[PDB]
């Protein structure tokens, strides 16, 4: 009767709702996602945050206070909330905020990639460093403290400013919503 | 089925060992010895995991057979030997001594100490037989046994503690179980907690007696008398935590 590793993403209750399909199609094009699986993964992350917040609203002390503090400091660390935040703000959060904390998206920002799809390729081909560490997982959620340490790899041609694609990417220095 | 157990699976191991339960399949099954399985850990784990003088059991066994680790002043060459609560693990080549004591989490740890205290071992008396020759055998919680005479048989009582000079086994400083006695808990919920005794309740039949204990910060908590280990009259005098 043992453990049996379970999925960390939830699929929708109905597969063919026009509203959900349209919404997800838009998100997937905006954020350049390969998989509904990937999207639903981040949705499930959010859902678990929300459920914890709910429980801790409807909870009592000495524990469920610890977990309140832990939830809030985790979300601060991830960059989803400010330090002065609350469970009300958890419930205000969105999957878009999560996807904005992906690495692919921050690299489309930080003017490093010119396109989320090219950001994906840079990550996967090994041209992005986070705190000196090569990361190749574009779904990696960046911490708000690691965000300012994102850079091309030292062993990357894109780190040579003479590189053609680097020159194009910096011909278009842009950021903001991603 | 047909007989005794010669093995132990690392998941089925004691909860008080600091063992890394999922890394391998097997654990050292302790030999019968001084203490119990609930209040002990094997010397291999002490030499290899706790102190880190070996990454491997072959190295540890070489060490133990060379004779570099004492347990209460005696060389112990077996890697399955039980090392228990309030035991002194000495390494002279390094000049280190450790007291095996429990943690607040309930697990066994090594508290560093020096030579003076390292020549001391407190022993809860835990029983008292009358043996042939009309002599008194004190039956102590490390499974040890001390013979005394019908003269001080009354100075010696069951829940008391005896400080013992261990490479020689000479009693010094009987510490009685009374009110005001400084105490160190060894098991339960209030594990690595200490204070002065306040009260004792008796509970008619085989229900164990209970002691009410006052900590340093004035708090006041109960536990079992058998789990209440006396370390001093008014001060622990054995450098506990």
């Amino acid at each position: 009767d043992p453990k049996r590793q379970r999925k960390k993403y939830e699929t929708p209750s109905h597969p063919w709702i026009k509203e959900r399909l349209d919404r997800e199609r838009v998100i997937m094009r905006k954020y350049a996602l390969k998989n509904k699986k990937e999207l639903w993964r981040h949705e499930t992350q959010l859902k678990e945050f929300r459920r914890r917040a709910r429980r801790l609203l409807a909870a009592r002390g000495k524990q469920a206070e610890v977990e309140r503090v832990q939830l809030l400091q985790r979300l601060n660390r991830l960059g989803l909330l400010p330090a002065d935040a609350v469970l009300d703000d958890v419930l205000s959060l969105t999957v878009e905020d999560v996807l904005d904390r992906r690495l692919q998206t921050i690299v489309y920002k930080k003017g490093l990639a010119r396109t989320p799809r090219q950001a994906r390729q840079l990550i996967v081909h090994g041209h992005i460093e986070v705190n000196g560490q090569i990361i190749r997982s574009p779904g990696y959620l960046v911490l708000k403290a690691e965000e300012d340490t994102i850079t091309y790899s030292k062993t990357s041609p894109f780190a040579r400013e003479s590189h053609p694609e680097r020159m194009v990417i910096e011909q278009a220095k842009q950021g903001g919503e991603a | 089925r047909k007989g005794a157990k010669r093995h132990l699976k690392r998941l089925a191991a004691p909860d008080q060992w600091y063992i890394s339960r999922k890394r391998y399949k097997w654990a050292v099954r302790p030999r019968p010895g001084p203490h119990s399985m609930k209040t002990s850990i094997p010397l291999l784990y002490i030499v290899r995991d706790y102190l880190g003088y070996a990454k491997t059991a072959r190295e540890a066994r070489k060490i133990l057979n060379e004779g570099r680790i004492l347990v209460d002043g005696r060389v112990r060459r077996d890697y399955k030997f039980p090392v228990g609560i309030m035991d002194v693990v000495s390494i002279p080549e390094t000049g280190e001594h450790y007291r095996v004591l429990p943690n607040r989490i309930g697990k066994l740890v090594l508290h560093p100490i020096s030579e003076k205290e390292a020549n001391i071992k407190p022993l809860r008396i835990s029983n008292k037989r009358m043996v042939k020759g009309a002599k008194v055998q004190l039956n102590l919680h490390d499974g040890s046994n001390h013979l005394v005479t019908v003269d001080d048989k009354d100075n010696y009582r069951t829940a008391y503690t005896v400080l013992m000079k261990v490479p020689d086994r000479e009693v010094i400083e009987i510490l009685p179980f009374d009110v005001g006695a400084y105490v160190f808990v060894t098991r339960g919920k209030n594990v690595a907690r200490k204070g002065k005794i306040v009260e004792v309740r008796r509970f008619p039949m085989g229900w164990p007696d209970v002691v009410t204990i006052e900590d340093e910060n004035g708090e006041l908590f109960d536990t079992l008398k058998e789990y209440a280990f006396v370390v001093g009259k008014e001060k622990p005098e054995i450098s506990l935590p």
Partner: protein, 97 residues
């Protein structure tokens, strides 16, 4: 190659210095045990007859390998304590047939 030591702890029971170190190999492959050993004896004037390298492990996306080496006070302790496969790897021993 650049060696940068992290920890150097003695073990009088077995008789060996245990060295944990970083090998920075920016731009190059992870170095060979021979070259690491040479640089290590230089960085620390050790007896290469007794120095034995346990591991050099390179990680994902780092070009900073992590190594564990051992420096015995006596070759006899080395041959007694240390296993034959490690000795063969460092080349102290030609496998005995």
């Amino acid at each position: 190659m650049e060696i940068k030591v992290r920890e150097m702890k003695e073990n009088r029971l077995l008789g060996r210095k245990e060295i944990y170190f970083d090998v920075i190999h920016e731009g190059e492959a992870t170095p060979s045990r021979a070259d690491v050993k040479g640089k290590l004896v230089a960085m620390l004037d050790l007896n290469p007859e007794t120095v034995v390298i346990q591991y050099i492990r390179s990680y994902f996306g780092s070009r900073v390998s992590r190594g564990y080496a051992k420096a015995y006070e006596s070759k006899e302790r080395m041959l007694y304590i240390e296993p034959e496969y490690v000795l063969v790897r460092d080349g102290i021993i030609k496998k005995e047939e």
